Amino acid sequence: QTCASRCPRPCNAGLCCSIYGYCGSGAAYCGAGNCRCQCRG
């Protein structure tokens, strides 16, 4: 819920921090319109 506060690396490897504050995988989290940071896992 607060992943952006831990940019540049909020998540486990392979996951990305979304604009809504959660870590997750795939284009759903890592794509430009969804990704805050850690957008290459």
Q: Using alpha carbons, list the distances in angstroms from residue 39 to 2, 20, 33.
A: 16, 14, 11
Range of the domain at 39: 2-41
Tell the burial category of 11 from Cβ atoms under 10 Å away from its Cβ (0-12, 13-18, 19+). Answer: buried
11, 37 contact by CB (below 8 A): no
Give backbone dihedrals phi and psi of 18, rounded to 5 degrees, phi first: -85, 165
Torsion on CA atoms 29, 17, 4, 9, rounded to nearest 10? -160
Method in brief:
X-ray
Q: Which residue is it, tokens 């989290």?
A: 29
Cβ of 3: how many Cβ atoms within 10 Å?
23
Question: What is the number of domains present in the chain?
Answer: 1
Give the domain CATH number at 32.
3.30.60.10
Eight-state DSSP code of residue 28: H
